[PDB]
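Duplicate of #3305? Posting structure anyway:
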């Protein structure tokens, strides 16, 4: 429900580091 880089459908995923 909330993360960065990490799922397949809702909306986060990844994106930096």
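Output from current build:
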């Amino acid at each position: 429900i909330a993360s960065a880089s990490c799922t397949t459908x809702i909306c986060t995923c990844s994106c930096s580091s």
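Confirmed duplicate; merging threads. DSSP finds no helices and no strands in the chain. Residues 6 and 12 are 6 Å apart (CA to CA).
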